[PDB]
Design a protein around this ligand. Sequence first.
Ligand SMILES: */C=C/C(=O)Nc1ccccc1Oc1nc(Nc2ccc(N3CCN(C)CC3)cc2)ncc1Cl
Length: 288
Amino acid sequence: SLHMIDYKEIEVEEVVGRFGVVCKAKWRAKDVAIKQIESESERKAFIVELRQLSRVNHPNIVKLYGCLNPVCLVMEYAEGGSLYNVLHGAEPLPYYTAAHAMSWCLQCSQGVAYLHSMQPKALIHRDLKPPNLLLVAGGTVLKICDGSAAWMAPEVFEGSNYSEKCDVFSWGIILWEVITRRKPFDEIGGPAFRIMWAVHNGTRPPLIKNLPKPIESLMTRCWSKDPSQRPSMEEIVKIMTHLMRYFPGADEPLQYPCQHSLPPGEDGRVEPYVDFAEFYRLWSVDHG
Ligand SMILES: */C=C/C(=O)Nc1ccccc1Oc1nc(Nc2ccc(N3CCN(C)CC3)cc2)ncc1Cl
């Protein structure tokens, strides 16, 4: 169910970054992101990617508009950049709230669950990380697309036959990342294998001061060593959906500046970046 575009319609603008190269473009009075081919050697790689980018259609997944000469791909241009850039990119960094953090994660679990539910075979993302999570609509709508050791389940680089529960591990790490606005395992550093060794040994990001026990529970379950003890994405979506009742305001665009500074990890427990005062407030009104 694809679409063809005269490569003469594509108004190739400038490059944006990088498999292949990605260039901002225009096409039918809209902004568009195109993914050129780098050499003949990548002909086959582009193929498998387009077999699944047609099957897939979901709000929280990058839309493929539709062309092939030279091998190209026509996708929607997320003006907001990567979530990684929002969290840790070049200053000025935008200010965001606890509701933004939860909405981003909710929207991500929604997109992954659609892939896990794909027929006939469940499509596994295998590389869930903020660099691959793009933002649109003032940074309020997250969308998925295609040094990952920080977000990698310990059974993946273990070579074991893995499943879709490795994305659940990634999601868990991402939830800790938007709440703390910290790069996971930035203290370890070194080459990737030094993080792989740490996570494989059981190391996890530190716990968050004054984190709601429901959120702490879900986060830790998602990054259990035993994949079968991690919840399904369907379960994550459900839980995140019902928690949003206590996180209003995910619709407000990111527009306010932020001079963000990072306290060191004093005593194995880190301070969150977002504020949960409004959550404990709304929660007590329903309970007590
Ligand atoms: C979809 C997976 C993926 O890898 N996306 C992606 C990552 C990095 C670069 C390009 C990519 O592609 C797309 N990019 C966009 N939109 C976009 C806008 C701006 C930026 N910049 C601006 C600032 N610099 C410093 C860094 C990032 C990146 C991306 N939209 C769609 C797609 Cl497919």
